[PDB]
């Protein structure tokens, strides 16, 4: 109301002084003394005031810009989009606000199943057939059902009701509906029933998983044939001993377009084609759930570290590329480990598709508590009782009894004794459904076997192979390692992230949708560290980038199947570069421009991984792995970090297209989902072909880094596992500076997701001893008959057998506990075995004391590291991080000039030869 | 990202932002680091 609002903004403390300034100096001195026991802090209003001038412009200027591609290109294997990243005068652009808005259509292929179970008749039994017809030696047999109860039956069909006096009969296209039957529980008489039965030309499927498309508006499915009229014939049935004749059951025969779009047959009884009686025993099993989606943080779209497909950021005057990418850099993993350190990695950010690959901890490490099934769980009939007998009311005489038929009827359904019931163990069935769906179906393929009478694919990287390999439920049944927190030895070397409980890929698949055909709209971040946080000064810059079209790289399936064979395809419609400018004032952004063009104000960046990446191949079942770095100035060396990979699961980057890479699961090289850490025995590091590192009698075994042991005579293991005491000391000092003043649980901010202690899980179980137990008999999976007559044999099919005392496993408890031996191991996922190049294995700075040592800085030393690993029957890799200082310094001296100097030490990418 | 620091050069860790017992909730008063 007042032209100068300041005298009453200062009075009410809207704009003015802090409470340290407007209060009396004795009250401020009082409130600081009593602050811990009598708070006067919130009793006084403290104003905060935004700056008016020289912060935000008043001119017409956009926050977000839209950059059309100047020069786009669609290869059959990649996509290239070239832009003009024009930063105008008195404007600054942080390249973190820049991203690519990619549109297109994603085809997930026929092998995508985003849900466990089936969509159609899931409550049906798996052996329950449809109402089907067949031929025997030829007569056409009918096995059907007539649930509807009408009024009368003539040759026109069943009478569903009247319209006045005219009998209005059932419309044969959709009536009688297969969902409508009796509503009462007691089996009253139906003299005029009807139902629907599939014809003999319709192929016989089980009810579980059966779908036919509806061919009219009223939902009545049936093949329309041109003459466009449905052929639904009526089939009248009567009593066997009745053959006047009145028909009792009318079955509307029909041809449907029947299909099982999300199930498969787990038991084919007959190899022959055509309908038969034996095909009522075929049993349907749901297909394995396959989550096909873009990777976490959009790994695999963008060509990083492929210098043949290297992107461009250069000014349009010079067009000299300021991006100098390298093949022994890992820009994807440097961005996966960066987001763990500066943020909560458990959270989900849908815009960058930031949903971390995370297995379920019950599935990886089986913590088998048994089942809480002390009470029997019974099912009961519809009216509580079915086997009542007929009795007659009897009144006493005036010993003596006589019939009372005046008030009570002579027929009374009265049950004598307990009612009928059947018993099911519910908690065991929920736990046996858990272990089979999550663990037994994810076993290695050497454990499984081919189904009988089912055509299976020959390519093992096809989903049709992985779906149909039938696995015995007795391998992982509800009694495996009872009371042992023990991951299976079969399941250690199997990727836990290729699973349908991978909650990241579970989230990233549903973020696109549930269908095969997904038109997507994605925002892909920039990960190259020199241009990831770069603040561009004004100028005209070209900004060119290569995108992948490889469906084994841009997509992630939860089984790891070859998505090129499995019909997955991606098509890019258009890509737009967006860039959000801060609306800075044109004199402030001219001062900031002029300050940041000095050669002392150069923006310098560092890759978060900061490592040289060397994949050393390991042959199949090869225990010893010798590597060799020939000769180098080892100045500014930080340390090592290593993890075994798989050659099947790791693509050779630098190649723009690998036609022999038949895998679309989690790539541990790119996302940080490392899981083969436990397969290391020892590391022997010897500098200069003579000097063992660290030397100095540092370790209890001073010549090498013993990571784990089988033979432990001298007693050097930690954590009730087989990890040694030297190696647990190093790994707690490398990550946490913990170990010289006692081992303790590190703080929650140092113990991130990809760290050691978050993921180190020690385990122990007891198995039977074949050397001490006297009555030991090796019983294979063919002859183990626990749950003998209540469980299907070697199959998820129907039960078979008799009730009988089990023979497997041997009891480890009780008075008859067998002679048992302890097997110890550990699993430590998601992490890299860090060995820091420090004289006390501690992090006292990023540039360590041995990297500054005059031994390694003024001389050239050889390096001969000798890894010893567990044998694996698969060609595996070895991913050693040679930790360096991958540092860029960026100079922009004039408008549109972008000069960068890259340098990493020791493993530099430029010497006098280049 | 970095704990608070005084500059007496030498570089001295500052004790501000640490947790204390307070009769009133500490988020409405201070920033707790």
């Amino acid at each position: 109301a007042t032209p100068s609002m300041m005298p009453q903004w200062s009075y009410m403390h809207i704009s003015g002084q802090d409470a340290s300034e407007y209060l009396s100096p004795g009250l401020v001195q009082f409130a600081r003394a009593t602050e811990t026991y009598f708070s006067l802090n919130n009793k006084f209003r403290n104003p905060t005031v935004a700056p008016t001038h020289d912060v935000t412009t008043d001119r017409s200027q956009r926050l977000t810009l839209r950059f059309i591609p100047v020069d786009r290109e669609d290869t059959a294997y990649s996509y290239k989009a070239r832009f003009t990243l024009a930063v105008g005068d008195n404007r600054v652009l942080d390249m973190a606000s820049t991203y690519f808005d990619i549109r297109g259509v994603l085809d997930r292929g026929p092998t995508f199943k985003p849900y466990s179970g089936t969509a159609y008749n899931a409550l049906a039994p798996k052996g329950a057939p449809n109402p089907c017809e067949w031929d025997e030696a030829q007569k056409t047999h009918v096995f059907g059902q007539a649930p509807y109860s009408g009024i009368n039956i003539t040759k026109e069909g069943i009478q569903i009701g009247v319209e006045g006096q005219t009998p209005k009969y059932a419309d044969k296209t959709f009536q009688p509906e297969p969902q409508i039957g009796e509503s009462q529980w007691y089996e009253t008489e139906i003299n005029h029933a009807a139902g629907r039965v599939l014809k003999k030309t319709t192929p016989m499927k089980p009810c579980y998983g059966s779908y036919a498309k509806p061919t009219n508006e009223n939902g009545g499915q049936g093949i329309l044939v041109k003459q466009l009229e449905s052929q639904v014939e009526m089939q009248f049935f009567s009593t066997t001993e009745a053959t006047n004749l009145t028909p009792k059951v009318v079955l509307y025969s029909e041809d449907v377009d029947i299909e099982t779009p999300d199930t498969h047959i787990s038991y084919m009884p007959t190899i022959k084609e055509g309908n038969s009686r034996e095909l009522m025993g075929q049993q349907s099993m749901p297909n394995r759930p396959n989550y096909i989606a873009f990777r976490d943080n959009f790994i695999g779209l963008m060509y990083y570290n492929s210098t043949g497909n290297m992107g461009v950021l250069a000014g349009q005057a010079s067009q000299l590329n300021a991006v100098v990418d390298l093949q022994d850099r890992n820009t994807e993993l440097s961005y996966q480990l960066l987001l763990d350190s500066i943020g909560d990695r458990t959270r989900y950010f849908s815009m960058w598709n930031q949903a971390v690959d995370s297995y379920d901890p019950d599935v990886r490490i089986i913590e088998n508590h048994g089942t809480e099934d002390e009470l029997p769980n019974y099912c009961f009939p519809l009216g509580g009782v079915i086997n009542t007998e007929t009795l007659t009311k009897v009144k006493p005489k005036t010993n003596g009894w006589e019939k009372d038929a005046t008030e009570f009827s002579d027929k009374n359904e009265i049950r004598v004794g307990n009612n009928f019931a059947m018993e099911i163990n519910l908690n065991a069935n929920l736990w046996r459904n858990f272990l089979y769906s999550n663990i037994a179906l994810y076993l290695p393929d050497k454990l499984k076997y081919s189904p009988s009478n089912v055509k299976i694919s020959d390519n093992p990287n096809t989903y049709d192979y992985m779906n149909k390999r039938v696995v015995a439920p007795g391998l992982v049944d509800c009694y495996i390692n009872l009371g042992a927190r023990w991951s299976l030895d079969y399941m250690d070397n199997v990727n836990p992230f290729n699973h349908h409980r991978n909650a990241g890929l579970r989230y990233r698949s549903m973020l696109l949708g549930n269908g095969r055909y997904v038109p997507f709209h994605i925002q892909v971040p920039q990960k190259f560290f020199a241009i990831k946080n770069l603040l561009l000064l004004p100028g005209s810059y070209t900004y060119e980038w290569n995108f992948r079209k490889d469906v084994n790289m841009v997509l992630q399936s939860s089984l790891g199947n070859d998505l090129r064979v499995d019909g997955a395809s991606i098509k890019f419609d258009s890509i737009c570069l967006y860039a959000t400018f801060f609306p800075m004032a044109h004199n402030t952004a001219s001062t900031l421009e002029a300050m940041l063009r000095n050669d002392t104000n150069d923006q310098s960046f560092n890759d978060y991984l900061s490592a040289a990446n060397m994949l050393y191949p390991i042959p199949a079942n090869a225990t010893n792995v010798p590597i060799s770095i020939p000769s180098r100035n080892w100045a500014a060396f930080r340390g090592w970090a290593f993890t075994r990979l798989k050659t099947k699961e790791t693509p050779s980057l630098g190649s723009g297209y690998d036609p022999y890479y038949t895998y679309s699961g989690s790539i541990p090289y790119l996302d940080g989902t490392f899981y083969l850490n436990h397969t290391f025995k020892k590391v022997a590091i010897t500098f200069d072909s003579s000097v063992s590192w660290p030397g100095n009698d540092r370790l209890l075994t001073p010549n090498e880094f013993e990571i784990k042991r089988s033979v432990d005579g001298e007693g050097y293991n930690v954590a009730q596992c087989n990890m040694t005491k030297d190696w647990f000391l190093v790994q707690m000092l490398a990550n946490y500076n913990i170990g010289y003043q006692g081992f303790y649980i590190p703080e929650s901010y140092k113990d991130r997701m990809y760290s050691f202690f978050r993921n180190f899980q020690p385990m122990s179980r007891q198995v039977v001893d074949d050397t001490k137990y006297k009555d030991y008999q090796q019983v294979g999976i063919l002859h183990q008959h626990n749950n003998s007559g209540f469980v299907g044999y070697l199959a998820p099919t129907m039960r078979e057998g008799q009730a009988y005392p089990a023979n497997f496993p041997y009891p480890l408890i009780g008075k008859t506990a067998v002679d048992s031996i302890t097997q110890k191991k550990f699993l430590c996922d998601r992490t890299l075995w860090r060995i820091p190049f420090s004289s006390n294995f501690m992090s006292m700075g990023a540039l360590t004391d041995l990297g500054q040592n005059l031994l390694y800085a003024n001389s050239a030393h050889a390096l001969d590291m000798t890894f010893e690993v567990d044998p694996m029957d698969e060609p595996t890799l070895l991913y050693v991080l040679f930790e360096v200082f991958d540092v860029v310094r960026v100079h922009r001296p004039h408008r549109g000039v972008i000069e960068t100097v890259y340098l990493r030490t020791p493993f530099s990418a430029g010497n006098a030869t280049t | 990202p970095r704990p608070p620091v005084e500059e007496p050069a030498v570089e001295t860790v500052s004790p501000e932002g640490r947790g204390e017992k307070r009769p009133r909730p500490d988020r409405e008063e201070t920033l707790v680091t």
């Binding site: 409470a19 209060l23 602050e35 802090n41 919130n42 209003r45 403290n46 104003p47 | 920033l31």
Partner: peptide
């Protein structure tokens, strides 16, 4: 202390 600014909705 007394220098901490007052809690308001959105600023």
């Amino acid at each position: 202390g007394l220098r901490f600014p007052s809690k308001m909705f959105g600023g």
